[model samples]
Every structure is written in C-alpha cells, then in structure tokens.
Target: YVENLLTQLENELNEDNLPEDINTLLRKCSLNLVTVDVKPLLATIKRFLTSNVSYDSLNYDYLLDVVDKLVPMADFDDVLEVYSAEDLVKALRSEIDPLKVAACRVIENSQPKGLFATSNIIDILLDILFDEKVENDKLITAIEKALERLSTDELIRRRLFDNNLPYLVSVKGRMETVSFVRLIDFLTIEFQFISGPEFKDIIFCFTKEEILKSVEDILVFIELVNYYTKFLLEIRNQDKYWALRHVKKILPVFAQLFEDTENYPDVRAFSTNCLLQLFAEVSRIEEDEYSLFKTMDKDSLKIGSEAKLITEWLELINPQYLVKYHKDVVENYFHVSGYSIGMLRNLSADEECFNAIRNKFSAEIVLRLPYLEQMQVVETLTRYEYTSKFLLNEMPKVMGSLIGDGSAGAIIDLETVHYRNSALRNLLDKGEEKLSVWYEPLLREYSKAVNG
Candidate 1:
C-alpha cells in the first residue's frame, strides 16, 4: 500500500496533464496513510517540507490538505506529551518556512493557548523572526498575533519572556517601522514580569544599541525610562542585597552600554540611572558588606574587586588637592558616571589632575567607613558564634519572608585576608575558634542557598 501511494505520488508529480481525480486520490492516500500510522506519514511529510518541492504548483493544495487532515488525527497532544522538548524543536525545525508558518498559524488559530503555550514554539517563532530570509510581513504579522494571543495567558507570557529575550534582542537590528517598536514595547512590558536575577542577566545580553534604540519616540522614551528607572530603583531599594550583588556582576557591562551614546536617550538615561542607583545604594549602606564586592580591593587585580583599589589608586597616584574630590569620585563615580573598571584604572593612572581631585574624596569616604566602624562592629558581633551565627540564620528568616530568598553568601571571604584583615582579626578575636568553624559551613550553606 505504501509503495502504491509513492507510485501515485511520483506519477502525479511527473504527469504534465495530471488528472484531478488521481490527485484527490493521492491526497486521500497520504492523509489516510498518516492516520493509519503517523510515523510513516511523518517520514513522507518530511520529504515534502524539507526537500525542494515546488509547493506552488499543482497537487500542492493536496499536501496542505493532507497535513490539515493528519494534524487532527495524528494525536498531537500525545505526541507532545511523549516527545522531549528538543524533539519538538527538531520537528519544528525540520519543516520549511512556509509550511512551518502555516503550521504555526494552524496551531495559533485552533488552540490559541494550547500548543503555542510551549516554550519551544516561541523559540522557533523567534528563530524565524531573526531569519533574514523569512521576512514576510504577513508571516510576521501572523506570528505577532499568535504571540499576542498567547501573551494574554500569564504563564505563556512568562515562559516566552524567559526564553525569547535573547532572541528578541538578537533580532532588534533587523526590526523596523511598527514591528520594531511593537517588539520593544512587548519586551519592555515583559521585563516587569521576569525575576530580578533573570532580568539582570537579560539586560546584560542587550548591547548599548538595542537597549537605547528600544524607545525611539520621545513619548515612548519617557514611558520606558520612567518605567525602567522606577523598576530598577525599586529593585535597588527593595532587593538591595542582590541588586548590589548583580551590580558588581554587571557593572562592566553597564559601563560598555553607557559609553555608546548613539543609543536611544532613554536607554542611556536608564543605564545612567541604574549606575547611579547602584553607587548610591553602595554608598548608602550603613553596614558596607565589602565582602559582597568582587573587586572591593583593587590591588587584587580581580575584575569586580576594584572599588577599594580605585579609591587607593586615585589617592596615591595623585594625592587629592581638594577634600571634595574623593567625595565626587564616590558620589559621581570617578568623574565618568558609568565608567568601566578597566577604563577607570587607566584614567586613574594617566590623568594626574583627576587623580589629585579624586583622592581627597576617597579620604573622606575612608573616614566615614573607618577601620572598625559601624559595619565592622556589626560584622564582628555577627561573626561571634552566639550572636553572629544566630543573626545569620535569623536575618534570612526575616529578609527571606520579604524577597524570594534572602540567604547571602559569606560577604567576607575571610580567606582573602588581604582585602579585610582587620575584619578577619576582629572575627577571630571576638568570635574565637567557634566562629572559625562557622566560616566553612556558612560559606558552603550560603552558596547553596542563594545559587543552587
């Protein structure tokens, strides 16, 4: 029966004057063959979708009609349930664009919220969105409508946002006119729903251009910037710990975005606001957890540890001629508001005037954050087995109630004694060997809690 159908299919393709009856029979045979056993039918359909078949010509309607028939009978729900996500991805990728687009439309129109709900579908749609050759407005419009429909479902929207942010950002350079703006608009709104950690990661994926150009119109810019700034500020104030945590993680990235002014005004403005918020939050901390910082001590040559390094470098490279210069570097951030660490390192070394000016402010900063200031005292008390460990466990109980999870890794890697020797000595002197035992477990537990 399979051989007979193949013969009919081949004959139908080759015949110059193919009979309508034969074509109809061929369509029925393929459709029924699929219904009888979808595995063989899927293999046959793969030939049509993947091979160079001019579906524009005759008997093509049969192919689509057969697909339409097979879809309902092929146990799609069960197929999806049984297949791994990658399997679906493989299936979706196997189809050619037109067929795939048609399949997507069919899925969109029939079960607006069913098959399209899967992350795999969104992934494929995004892949097509970025495919230069698949630039059909109608196809894109269909996809947009399909996505909009799915967006109405929160879970679907959330999943799409999580998976497609990178693809959406990747395709921004290809977008234009209304499609471009609409894409950015959707992304901006979607950003709100994403988790703070995920959102931070996503934001870093965007180049200075996409984040900037996302709001081309001034009105949109105002809305986006206001929305973005408020969102970041709220995170900075509310999730101060992780916000600062990722700030250290993403600062170099933010600096890169800030340097390219060709980006949209609001984007630049928003990036500027984020940097300010970050520094402001750092400066505002009564108990400065210098351990949370990667490069808190610039001398270490670590990427994130440069804050203290920058302060010392600025002061020593050229002593602050004015007392206010140090404050300005901390407050205004080394003269360049969103300066990259590497860039700032170089500037601190080269610019004698900047070095002289910033050093004074650094001194003032050091005085406020004295060797055993409020933070050190608190840190010392906390390091004590009875008090510090108690608070460590209790602090999480309180802060965790507010945020997703408030467990923080050992902010002070006491092992890096070079960065905070006084703090470590205080830990030992005040907390004793009992406190020392907690360090390994605390570091391990905190690492597990926050990350894993």
Candidate 2:
C-alpha cells in the first residue's frame, strides 16, 4: 500500500501540476509509513527533488516534510550514504530563499550524529555568513542558525576557532549589533572550549583598538569584556606578562566606564569586578613569589633581588596607596566599593585610612545601591570592625527597605542570612541602642522560626 502511494507521489512530484489530492495522499503516507521501510521512498523523493525539478518549481514544504520524517525513520548512515550533504551545500548557492532555508534546516536537523560534522558543512555555512554581499536577511539568518547548531560539536567548534575566528573578529565593525552579539556569544563559548596556546592566539587578536571599537555597542562591549575576563581568569598562570600587559592597558578604559554614572549599574559593576580580579591576580602572583622565597633557605635563594622587588610592589599596593590613587574613581562604584572595603578590612591598615574609604560611600550602600550591591555592602561590612557604625545606623533602614520590597527573603537565604545575622549581632554587641529598637522584634521573629 505504501509503495504504491509513494510511487504515485514520486511520479506526480516532478509534474508541472501536482494534483492536490495526490499531494494530500503523499503527506498522509509519509506520516503513516513509520512501521514500513520508507528508505526507498525517501531516496526516490530526494532524486526527484534534486534532479528533475527547477529551483523555482520545487515544493519546499514537501521537501521539508520528507526530511522531517526521514531524519528519524531512515537510518542516518544509510541516508548519508544515499543523500548528499554536498548537494545541499550546492543548493545553498541557488538564489531561491526557501531552497536555501530548507537546505539549512536539513543540515541543522542532521547535526552531530549524521554526516553534518564530517563534511565541509561548517566551511560552507561560514562562507555564507562572512559573505558581505549576501544581504538576504532570511538567508543570512538561516546560515547563522546552522552555524550555531554545528558549533555545539567540539570538532566543528575548533575548526571555527582555528580558521574562522580572525574573520569573525575582523568583520565585527561591519556586522549589525545583533549579528555581532551572536558572534561574540559563539566566541565566548569557544574561549572556554579552547584554552592555553589556542586561547593565547585568540587573546592576541584582541588589540586595544578592537576593544575600543567594540565598545561602541554596549552589549558587544559588555560581552567582550566578560568573555575576556573569564578567559584571563582561566589561564592567568600560562601567560602572566601578557595578562598583566593587557590588564594594565584595559584598566584605564574600565576605570572610565566605572566612573561614568551614566553607564548601567550592572555594566559598571562588571567593569569594576574585572579590574578587581586583575588587581588581585597580579597581587596574588607577587605574594606567591614572596612566600616561596621565605620558605627557601636564606643563602640558597639566588633570586633574593626579585623577592625584594615583589615585596616593594606589594607594599606599594597597600590600602593607603589604593585609597590615595583609585578610591575616588572606584569608591562609589558598587562592586568596586564593596571589594575595596573588603580589601581594606583584610589589610587591617590604619583605621583612619579604612574610615576614609568607608566614609566615602557608606550612606549610598544602604539607600542608593541596587539589591545585589546592597548584599555585597552588607556582607563586606559585617566581616570587619570599622563598619559597626554604618551597620548600626544604616542596616535597620536597609532591612526595612528589603522587607518592603520583599527582598528580605534574599537576605535570609542560607549564605546571605549568615552575613545579615552577623552584622546584627555585631551591632548588638556594641550596645548600640538604636539597633535593639529597630531589630529586636525581627530577631525574635527569626528566633521563633529557627526554633520551630
């Protein structure tokens, strides 16, 4: 029954007038032929569609239906044996949009498991993507979708990273923000996939000019910084000098962004975090070197001069120095502010210096900062002594605001409630008269919940 129906459909498929009834029968047979051997049926359909029909006359919906059913029902190995992915690649060059999109759909559906990975499919898709003249938005979008799917394969990903990344980067300024954002996302995924030497190659392409130009679009700028920051964090030891050089060069740009109150809070926060991380990495390297020398026997250490230099650099990075130079720029930036305060606490430097850092942004922490930044502020202040006044005076209002907005539950989560409770206890221990009036009822409520 299925063979007769498919044979009739095949004969009618190439005819200039395919009868509606025969077309309807073909659709129904394609669906119901699941238990039957539909391999020859699919092959017959493929030959008719690819050979006899002109590009304009082809029934794309029918072809897509055949592909959709055949993908699951037919053996992938056997389908590749008969059907040519190369033929589909050739069809992509056809001026027909539906044909191109259908070809892309077929390639996308056949991914990873089928011949989609083994062939020059990725190369073909990239050719279309990088083609400046192919302004057919639908066609370009289809090609991007195909590339995106293919990128999920590690083999295809490396092929893209090693060969096409330079092209992707070079064309960033020419591409639309939406398309460039997609490219950035693909590259970000690839960064995690390719580390060490390949990572260095990718990093090398990010010249300061490229970084500066990419920031013209805020989304692209933020994504590029985030991915670059993540890559630096991953492989800091492999290329310390390269990392240090770029971090130093990139700092001024980020510093400017961090100080720009016009920038979104999250973007500014992310910029600050990147700077803090890079600073911490450089400081960590110095500390590790210094500690290694201290552990070695005195006379055996031939690198004593290097150790002394590192010690001098570390001393220069103290709270006073940071407050003197960077505090004015970074102290009001929420992530930087919280991180700087935490660094001061750890440094245990002169109380006045810590207070100077603390006093600059104390009120803003409670009333002005966003919820996550507020959490950071509360967490940082609870850990040290100097913030007792801020905690006592401002935390009650902060908690009240949180309760009003239902953000108080976020504070009560396991990790955060510890900080919240610690700050409360510290204030209570100081015999701060105002905190008891503000927090005593809430403490009782919290205690009752805990006991229950």
Candidate 3:
C-alpha cells in the first residue's frame, strides 16, 4: 500500500497523471510523512512554497491547507527546518489568512535552536501586528502569541522598540485593557534593556494633541495617560522639555478626567493620583531657572522679548484645583481620603489641608467607610494632631462592634486594635479628648489584642 501510494504520489508530483483532487492526495501523503519513508510529502510542500504559486488560488489552497494542518498539531520541525527563515517569512507576508496564521504558529513553536534568531523576522511580525487592514482574530492571536514568545529574547524586544512598535500602538485608535496592558507590560522591561532620549520619542507619542485632547473612549484615554504618567515617572533623569511639554497638555486632560463625574469614581481616583505623581515631578523642573534656560531652545529666545505671560501655564499646572477636588472627594465620596489627606497634609495650611480631612466631610459620612481601604481613615484621621471632635463620638462605636460583634481573629482583631485603637489611644492620651469618656469598655475590649 505504501509503495503503491508512493507510486501515485510520484506520478502526481511529476505531473504524469494529475488528479482532480490533489488536496486529498496531498493530505494523505502528508499524514504518512512520519509513518513511512514517504519523505517526498514534506519536500513537495517545501517546493510548492518556493514555487511562485499565487495565493487564494486552487494551487495555493492545497499547499496552505497542508501547512496549516501540520504547523500547530505535529512534531514537524525537521521537515520545517528545511525551509529557511526567509521561506517562512514569505509565507507570513502573504495576503492569505491561514498562511499568515500558520506562519505565526511556525515562528513561535519552531525548535529552539535559533530558528528565527535574527531580527529581520521580527521586523515583519511587528508590521503585520500593527497593520490597519489585518483584522483577523485568529491572525492577530497568532501574531501576538508569536511575539509574546519571541519577545522573551532581548534582540526581539530591542527590535520591537527600534521599530517604534509601542508608539504605533498608542495612536492606532484603541484597545481592551488586557491587550494594551500587556503591550505596556512588555514596554516596561525595555527601560532596562535600552537607555535614554528614545524615551522622549516614545513619550512624544502621547503628547500628540489629538491623543491628549480628544481621544473618545474614557478608559482608553485614562490607561494611555496613566501609563504615560507612570512611564515619565520611570525615567531616571527625565528631560525637562519632555516633562514640560507633556504636562502642559496632560494637566488639563487629567483635570477633566478627575472632574468627569460622568466617569467612574475609582477611575477618577486613579487620575487624581496620576495628577499627584506628575505634580511631584513638576517642582523638580518647572521652577528651576537653569531648567528653563538649558531646556529652552535658541528658537524660543527670539520670542522672549514678547510679553510672555505664563498665566495660563501657571494655572494649567497648579495643584490648587486638585485641593478643592480632593476636598470634595473626602467631602462627598469619602473614597481615597488618603489623597485628600496627602493634599491636606501639604495644602490646607493651619493647616487647611488637615481641615479637609476633618471638617470638609461630615463625621457621619467619613466614619461610615464602606470599603476596607477607607477604614484607614481611623488611622489617618485620628493620628492628625487636631481630631475633629465629632469623630471622638463616632470612632469608638465602630471599634466597639469589631471586638463585641465576634468579628474577631488575631490578625483581624489586631488589624483594628493596633492600627485603630492604639493610634486613637495615643492621640487621646496626648490630649483632653477624653478617651475613657468615649468608651472605656470599647477600649477595654481592644486591650487584649493591643497588648499582643
């Protein structure tokens, strides 16, 4: 049976008697490739790939179907190895989807002995991944998987950055959090892999006025800005020009995000935190005369004679607006009061910053923290030198139920006792808020856990 099949395959390969169903003949021969000395089946596929066969035709279909069948599910690398990386790359760039997807599988799953070891193969993969017209899910999945595996190599990663892959990604409309996040996750490693100035290039992608000023999807907008903010923070010695340029545009966008009550509160909280981070870097550069002169170019010096009032920039970059925003956050949502406290710790001087944590929000709202994080209020608010006297009445009752309600464990009780009761205990003892007047028994219930 083997020899007779081989005779028919030979007759077919030689075009001595071409059958109407070459695909059936090819698949049968391909399945027998490993089982018998029917090695011409593999060689025939290679010759077809090398031959100038037009894709999307009857001839190309038979070859691509066999390549697809064998690529993912079989141990056929030695057969594949006979095709150079160039042969596989040609298959990748083909207009046919299965061929591209099959090429991607071949790339990622190829034997680890340096099969696609060169940067040239990756350059094309980057092109296809970002190509606007290539909207096939299986195709995109294949390319991403290929890149995900190929990207483990330092050379593959460097080539990706060198080709402006991440920058292209930012401007190519939008994507899911899970996708861009991994791209940024991949981009994160390059901070160590490469060095300097190109960071300015990568960052300038976000600085595009369209991106900062008007990208429509709010979540995409935030993730792009948030990651760019974190990316700016990551640079060891950030260029002031890059810093000033981005903040001038992004400060208002972030402000808009924070004030966008139409948006999610927690997402607003993140943008609010992003504002704090960029502001932290601003005092580093925006104020220094040396930064101003050294950073400003010769072209800008000609405009220096104009009455260059920085009134708008001063307003644009200021944190004072965020102070009110935070005050309202503590006043209204009572979420992320730490930011309010951080702002207050610095801003409401008297400080009025501390004033917000206490007076801006009602004791009833602030004390009734619905989430575990807001529970830190018991620690943050009480530790402040001036406790809003209302919490003096409210704080003890919440502590009371913890020990009294049987919601007790060593860690759970200690989480409340040590962080809550002890800090409350210290400030109360240091002052005349009257600890024993509040709840002597509540304090007594907390003592066993506190002592440990």
Candidate 4:
C-alpha cells in the first residue's frame, strides 16, 4: 500500500505539471508513513522543499511536521551530507515560520558535531535576528538559542560580541524580554572574558545616551543596569581609567534610580549596590593619601579627581538611606551592604569607623555564621578585619568549633578543621598585630580540643 502511494507521489513530485491533489495525497501519506519508514518519506519531503515549486502550493506545514519528527532520527553526518547549511540558512529566510523554526532546529541539532562553528552559521543567525521581516517569535527564540550555543565557543563568542553587541544596544527597547535577556547574558559572558581596550569598547555602548534612553521597561532597565554595574565592578581594579570614565557617566543614572524609591523600589537596592561597589573601589585607592600623592602623575591625578567625585557623591547619599535599608540590602543581595559599610568604615579612624566596619562584618558574617561556608566567610572576614577586636574575640571560638577533636566525629571534622585553621594562621602571620594576640590562644585551644 505504501509502495504504490510512494511511486505515484514520486512521479508526480518530479513533474512540472504536478497537481494539488497529488501534493495533498503526498502530505497524507507522509503523515501515515511516519511510523512505517520515515527516512524515504523525509527524503521525499526534503526534495519537495528544495524543489522549484512554490512553498505555498506544497503544503509547507505538512513538510515541516515531517522534518520536525525525522530531524531527531536523521543521522547528524548524513544530514550534513544531504543538507547544506546554506540551504538551511536560505530556509531561514523563508516566509514560513514553522519551516524557519524547523531549519533552526536542524542547524541546532547539527551543532553538537561542531560543524557550525567553522561556517557562517552564527553570522546567518544574527542576520535573521536583525532581519526586520523575520517577526516570528518562535523563530526568533530558536535563533536566539542557536546563537547562545554558538556563544559557548570562545572565538565565536568574541565574534558575536563584536558583531552583535551594537545591534543589541540599538534594539534594546524593541526586544522581547527572553531575547533581550539571552543576548545580554551573552554580552555579560563576553565582558567577563575580554580585557583592556576591547573591554572598554564593550562598555562604551552602555554609556551612550541613545542606549540609556532605550531602557523604558522596568525589568529591562534593571537588567541593563545590572550588566553595566557588573562590568564596572569587574574592571574597576584592572583598568582604573576606563572604569572611572564609564563609572562617572553610569553612576548618576544609577544614583537617580537609587533615589526614586516609590516607582523603582526593586531597582533602588541594586542601584545602591552598584554605587556602593563603585565607591568602595574608589575609596580603597583614596584612603592611602601617601600612595595617592606618591603615585600622583598625569594619569594618577585624573584617577584621583575621578575617585574624589565618586567619594563625594557617595558621601552625599543620606546616611539615613544606609541606616534604613542596610538590612534589606544585605539580606536580599550578598556583598552589597558590605561595600556600603566598608566605605563608611573608611571615613574615620575613630570608633565610628570601627563600629561601621563591625556592623558590616556582624551583619554579613557573624549573624549569618551558621549559614556561611567556613572558607568563604573566613576569607571575607579576614580581608575586612584581621585586626579588629571582633576578630580577636570571634576567631578562637569559630576556629575552635571548626578545628574539632582528633576523634572520628567532630564538629567540623579534622581535615576541614586543619584547612580552615591553616587559613586563619596564614592571615594572622601576615603582620596582623591586633589579631596576633589570639593566635596562641586559638592554637592552644585547638590543640587541647584535637587531643581529646
């Protein structure tokens, strides 16, 4: 039954004078033959797809349904041999949305073999995205996923970043959340990987007036702010000038969002966080006036001026702002309030500085002690306050619990105890005078606990 149907369909498919009934019958047979033997049927569908026949007359959705089903069963190498990426790329330009989606799936399925990496597939996908005529959400989504996969390759990521970032920026307001987020996520990955001038180039777009103007949707605005701030944090230490140049522009934008609590409550926390991070990085350099002056030069002076601007702006933030929101800021987002408090902590050598720093540590570290991982929390606490009275009092107790008994079962076990204590000792030994007093007590207590 299938053979006779196939023979008739094949002869009719090859003829220029093929009738609509034959094509319709072919569609029906293809649906039924899916369970029988889809390979020959898939091949016939592909032939029809590639034929000179108008896509409208060929029952495009029927052909696509068969391709969608057979695409998984089709051998990867065989698909490449039989179907050129060029053909799939051309199909992407088709007026049929399902056909474009199916072609995207085929290309995506073939990606595991690493064939698309060498081809212009990424470029083609970007073209489809930028093609104003291509408005199918499913098709755009499929292409977005394909581009995301291509972005996993380092070279491809760089190429895509270089080629598509500007376009993304230009279209930021126009993009749907899913596509926008995926593309921005890719940019974030690339920003983390690249460095120096290239890094500056990537961030430059974010600082543009047009780009900033494009952010109207609240979520999109939040993400754009997040990425820009994250990029600033990553580079602040590595490239001071470039970081400051962009930060000077971006800081005000975030600062406005920080102040506009009524309409942008969710955004305020992150905006404040970015501001605090920027201020923290700048304050670190400014705190040492001796070094600041000693290293002062044409470039350093510019940095000094930029750093001063950031410091002044941060200090202008109502102290009540920090007082009211500190808990929520730290609870909702890690390390944000830490930076804010750290900046305030750097302001004076008096007890105010001590209390500010202590408040940050206690909130971020001590209070969250049980939930905190030993290694990460210890590293952070030590960096913030190796010589504080808090550390002198807390270290021995925390270390004691961590450095458990030599017995089989202990609070933190022997191996972990030794590792964490080693970290503690290394920090104390590194010229932390105030903390050195607890070293012997910590060690002695640890020894007594271990022996038992």
Candidate 5:
C-alpha cells in the first residue's frame, strides 16, 4: 500500500498539468502514508531535502509534505541527529544537490524545535559551520541558528561560554564580522548565567593582552564593547529577562567595558546603569550579609579587592567623562542614592585636606565605611563639638537638598550615616543600631514621594 501511494505521489507531483483534485488526492495519500510509518516519510523527505533540488524549482508539494509531517513531532528530543558523520562527509564530497538541500532544510526546521544539544547533531553542524569546503550563507545561517538554539540549554549555554572562549577571541581578533557578532551575542547570553571562577576565567582570558593585539581593529573592539553595554541596559530594563537573572555575575563585565577608554558614549551609559545596579546589589548583599563582605573569608578580601580596582579605573578616567558619554542614559536612571551622597559629604568634611584626599579618592568609600573611621564632621556634630563651625553649618543644607528629605532628615536626626536600624529589619537587615536615627526621616521622605 505504501509503495502504491509513493508511486501515485511521484506521478501526481511530477505531472505537468495535473487536475487540482489529483494534487489534493496525492497530498491526502501522502498523509495516510505518514501515519503508517513516519520513518519512511522522514527518510523520503530527508533524501529530498539533502538533495540538490534547485530551491526556486523545488516542489512545494514535497517540501510541504515533509513540514506537515515533521513539525508537530520535532521536539528537542524527538529530532534525532539522523545525519551521520558519514553523511556529512558525503555532503562535503558529493555534488548531489538534493542531499545538500535536505541537510539545510532539516537543520533549519529542527533548530527552532531545539534539537541542537544532541552531541552528534552539534558536532556535525559545527563541522559545517567552520568548514570552508561547504561554506555558503544558507548553510552557515542554519548552523548558527542551530547553535544558538543549542546554547539556550543550560548545560550547552555554560559550555559555549567556556569552550568557545578561545575561538571567540580569535574570531574577534581576525575580525570575522559575521562570526564575531554571533559569538559576541552567544557570549553575552552565556556569561549572563554562569558565575564564580568560570565567569572570571573567560573575562580574564579575554583581557587586554588577548584583545590589545587587535588594537588596529578598534572598530571591532568598539562594537564588542557596545554589544555588551547594550546587553547590560537590556538586562537592566528587563529587555533581556534571561540576562538579568545573571546580573550578579555579569556585572563586572560591564564595569570592564566602561573602564576601557575604547568605549563609546552609549556604552558608557549602559555601563553606568550596570554600575548602579551593581551598587544596589552590593548594598543589599552587604546589608544582608550575603555579598562579598559577608561571604568572603579574610583571604578572599584581598581577592575581592579586584572589584575595587575596577572602580578605581572608573574614577581615574573621570566620572564626568562617563556622565558626558552616557549623559542621556545616565540622566534617566538613578545614581548612587542621595542617601549615600549625604553620607559622603559628611565623611568628606572632618578630614584635614590630606585625610580628605584619601577619603575622596577611595573607589569604595561607602560600603568600606564600617571598617574606616566614622566621617569626622558627622561624629563631631553628634558629639556637639566644633570641628569647623562654618563648614559644619553648611553641610546639612547641602546634604539635605542632594539627598531626599528622608535621608536629609535622617542625617540631621540621626546625625550620622550609621544609624539605629533594628526596626527596619523586615525591610533592611543591616544592623538597626546604626540606621534607626535616619529611619523615621527616610520613611517620612518616602511617604511624601508616595503622596506627591
């Protein structure tokens, strides 16, 4: 019965002027065959797809028949790597147009259904991707699209970042525009999720030494930086939801981009948003004892100082430069909160011009506070002592305007950056003893915003 139907399908499809009814009958006949045994249907379609059938003249009847049969069943797991290495070797060696066409179509349809993770399939696809012998836009597109789908798998996603690290750098180095762009996009996705040593390893591997050699390809570096910068913004704006999930890990990548003078204005702005997010996350984690301050053993403290170094790189380049470059973006998002702004002003006041220099220049002046001495002027104010009467009198007014009224009021009421905060435990777990003085003030300010 199957052989009879196949013979009828070939005759109906091949006929120069078949009746509409005959074509319709042929399709129905093929459908019936498909239900009898999909393997034979698949095998037939695969043969046609991998064949050299001219795309323009390729029979829609054949193509549609295959699509109609396979699409519904092609789940990530169901779509097997039926194309063996031997088949690929044949594709490389044979001039058979049907086989090439079949390979292309099968890979294309299977990609969206997420079949790229099958080890056999991916190896075959990559062999085609990098193979000069069979290189063509359609083939490359299919391979890339498949690899991209494969990268979405958690395991493949992580491995892509790790395994593709060297190749990605080389692609960028050689300035292969298409491959470089794809690799950058892939890396952005991969890095957004993986963390710890794995995360650091990739970034460190792609450090200045590896990249600087491509100094003449400034445009590529700029583009690569721009891509990451946009990635940060997309993540921040929830434009890239999956990317945001890896915010804690990918934050440093943004920091590095901004610190790189090669970065353009848009990149700088995106980096600023990233930095703000980093600051917010760090503050939350430090307060909760979940971040570096909390998690790090003493020895790790030295290791973590690398973060401070990135910040220092930012400061040395000039905050104003960042502000200028990303002005539009930076202006729109929140900066280091005015609350910290107020605290910083107080901290800056007590220093002799010399001590002030150290405090002013420190990259992590805020969170590093508990270990550092209390900002002298604020301490003096709480003690009702005169450090610089003229300077002290003007400090609150300046701090008040800059920090929100809640923070300003807290500054005056609590008279310190550190306040009693046990009451805020439900909201913020940082010790209440140091935060309470400002609690009511901050709360009042927050309430006003809500009402206003």
Candidate 6:
C-alpha cells in the first residue's frame, strides 16, 4: 500500500504538482544559480553528476534533485560549452577507464548534439572496439551509443568504409560476441566503397592471433556460428569470394571442432550445424549469384569438396551410436537429426550431395520430426523443381496439413520482422494450388524460381 502510495505521490510530482514548500525551495535554489554569471556553480554541477564512486550517494541525490530543476530553468549552453568532444574521444583511448566513464557521462548527457561525428573520433572508437583487451563493460555500451549518435550524420556514414577498420576476430578475444556483432550490424549500414572480398574476414578475422587459444564457452561459439552465417548471407558477395577459399576454411574449422573428442560431446553436433549453416549460405549465394539462367547455379575451386563430410556426419547422427553418447544424459541432446536433415537440404545445391541425399535422406524420416526439421525438408523441395515434383509428392499429407493448418505461417510470424521468413513462405506457396504460378514471357521464369 505504501509503495503504491509513494508512487502515487511520485506520479503527482511528475504531473507538475510539487507541494508549496518544496516548490519554493527548488525555485530559490535554481534562481540563485542563473542570477550570477557563476562559473563555480556550473563546474560544481558537472562534478556532482560526474561522481561514480560508491560513497557519492546522499549528497549526490540532493545535488541531482537541485540540478534537475536548474536544467529546465536555465539555458546553460555556456555551462556545457567547455566539453571538447574530440578530447572526449582522447579520454576513451586513455588506458584509464575512470576518466573515460566520466567522459562517457558527459558524452551521454551531451548526446544528440552535432559533435563527435568526425572520422577521427569514429576510428578511435572502432579501434578500441576491435583491439584485444579485457573490455570495460561500461565503456562498451557507451561507445555503441556514441557511435549510434555519430552515425546519424550522412557525412560520417559515408566516411565509415574509408577508415579501413580491422577485421573481426575468429577466436573470442577483443570483444564479446554480442557487442562485436553490434559493430558488424552498424558497419552493414554505414558501409561505403571498400576493397577485399577478402574471403577470409567473412568467417574469421585473420588479424587477431594473440588469443589463439581463446576459450569460448561452447554456447558462445555456437552463437558466433549462427551470427556469421546470417552475416555471410547479408553481404551476399559470393561471385568473387565463394569458389573454395571459404570452403577450405570451414572444412578446417569442422575438422578441428569435431575431431577433438575432449570438447563438449554436443560440440560435434553444433560444429555440424555450423558447417551445414556455412554450406547452406554458400549454396544460397551460388544460386543467387547468377541471373543469365535465371534458375541455374557451381564452382571454380579445384579442391575443398565435402567428399566424405555427408557420410561422416550421417554415421555420427545414426541413432545407434548417437543414443549411446546421450544415454542417461540429455534427452534433448543436440537435435542431430534436424541438423543432418538441414545439411542434406542445403547440399541439394550439389548434384553429388543431392544424389546422396536422394539415395539416403528420407522424407519419411523428416516428417516424423519436429517443425524445425520438417521445415528443412520443405525448404529443400522449394529449391529444386525436380525435388518439389518428386520429394514433395512423397509428403502430400505434410504439405496439405502445413498449408491448411499454417505451421509455416505461424513459425514465420513468431520470428522478428527482419528474420528470413521467405524460406518457409516459399514452401507454403509450393503446397497451394494457386494458378497464377503460370510462367509468362519476359517474366517467364519469375515465379518458378521465386515460388526461396
């Protein structure tokens, strides 16, 4: 009752109905400050807000309340004028963090201002972001917000690609997976004319070798794997980059991640998921990289084929051996079947892989599974007319149910608006008997390939 009572009082105060004595005292205090051209009072206010130490509480509260009134009452543009946003950037580069925290507060309070947008400050922030260090938690969020504000200017946005920021780290070191990806997302927007389809940076930063033995919790690495796959798709730079350089790197990654038996038992499964994700993305890029055929796709690489990868992964996911590893352990052990199904679905891009899947991977096996695996097979059918005609016909019950009952639509709706929903949607349309799927001249092959 009292909590709500106090909050009710708080609401009333927020409604601009301050009690008489309180209003008089605040007005008196604020009136004193604006009355003088007082530098000391302004400096004192900045210092009080700047305090971050443990002991600076009570009087800080008092000072905060006092200043809160002054903020609305006075135009102290002069008071905040002394803050040099560049040296604020300099403060961030100072291996000293306390000063940086203080500077960040000043930066935050002074945010939405037209400052710190220059290439100089932006590069300094990006350097700290990519460099190896025990990241200061407070500083990381502050820099993200700082850059978010700075990128608001079109000049700064165009200047982004020119700075030649360093590549991302393959191993976890410089920054945590979450923040590093935030920078990547930011770069995706502010990007300009840059070189190097540097196929290497697509998977791992060739740059940071200091933390070669970086110990990532299996989940973090898995999360990295998930994010990078989407990122590779976003750039969609497959024509120049996708021949086999990426394939070579991912194969090494798969070999190391799976062969090392000492790692988490599910590590192999996650690695398979990772490898499959890479293959799916590369396959997608390969399929989309060409336009002449409108409905065609292969490779320039002499090496790095997944010759035994499919069989090796198949044997690993076999119920007999897989059950032994998870017995008396996790019932929800890495949905290995789902991953294997997805791999075969993606591998449909290759005739050999496609034939191997045709010979072995089964619609009957896939249909008995959860929606995740079911969606994988549905996706494979959408990719190829032969598969849709043949494989999809094998699952009429599944398709008809999915179309009427709407599992595909429900799953697509569950994702964030930016998520790739078309994968499921394409499968849905394939099930429906809509006649406008007709091929017309000029736009002849349009709906056939589209209906990804």
Give me the candidate number with maximum TM-score: 2
Model 4 residue 321 lDDT score: 29
Task: Please give each candidate's TM-score.
Answer: 0.31, 0.46, 0.43, 0.45, 0.40, 0.42
In order, candidate lDDTs are 0.44, 0.53, 0.50, 0.52, 0.42, 0.43
Q: What's the ranking of the predictions by TM-score, best on top? A: 2, 4, 3, 6, 5, 1
Clashes of each: 12, 0, 5, 0, 25, 0
> Could you give candidate 6's per-residue lDDT for residues 411-452 as a string of tens digits?
443332211234434444554453123212213223333552
- Residues 1-452, candidate 5, lDDT per residue (tens digit)? 54566545555445555445654565466467477333444444555555454544444454545544453454523334455435544553456544554454454555444444433444444445544455466546645655554555565554454455455455555556555555565556554445444553443234454444433455555555555455545454544344333444433543444445554354444444434333333322312233432222122222123443333223222232223232332223212332333333332333342132332332233323331132322332233223223222434442233233433222333423332221112222223453344445545543543465
RMSD of each: 19.2, 12.4, 13.2, 12.2, 15.2, 13.0
Query: Which digits, one per residue and each the tens of the lDDT, describe model 4 over residues 347-449?
Result: 3233433344444444334333442254334433444443344544744544444433342233544355554555456555545365455556555654653
What TM-score number comes out for model 6?
Answer: 0.42
Find the number of clashing residue pairs for candidate 5.
25
In candidate 4, what residue range of length 10 has the lowest lDDT sum? 293-302
| Residue 400, model 3, lDDT | 44
Candidate achieving the largest lDDT? 2
Off by over 4 Å in 3: 1-84, 109-119, 161-194, 197-396, 405-452
- For candidate 4, the per-residue lDDT at 83 reads 63
| Per-residue lDDT over 121-220 for candidate 3, one digit per residue giving the tens place of the 0 to 100 score | 7768766766556678767777777776665565565566666565545634354444444455445444443444445454334445545433455555
Q: State the displacement of the C-alpha of residue 30, model 4, in Å, after optimal TM-score superposition.
A: 20
lDDT (Cα) of model 2: 0.53
Candidates ranked by lDDT: 2, 4, 3, 1, 6, 5
**How does model 3 fare in lDDT?**
0.50
- Superposed by TM-score, candidate 5 places the C-alpha of residue 429 at a distance from the truth, in angstroms, of 30
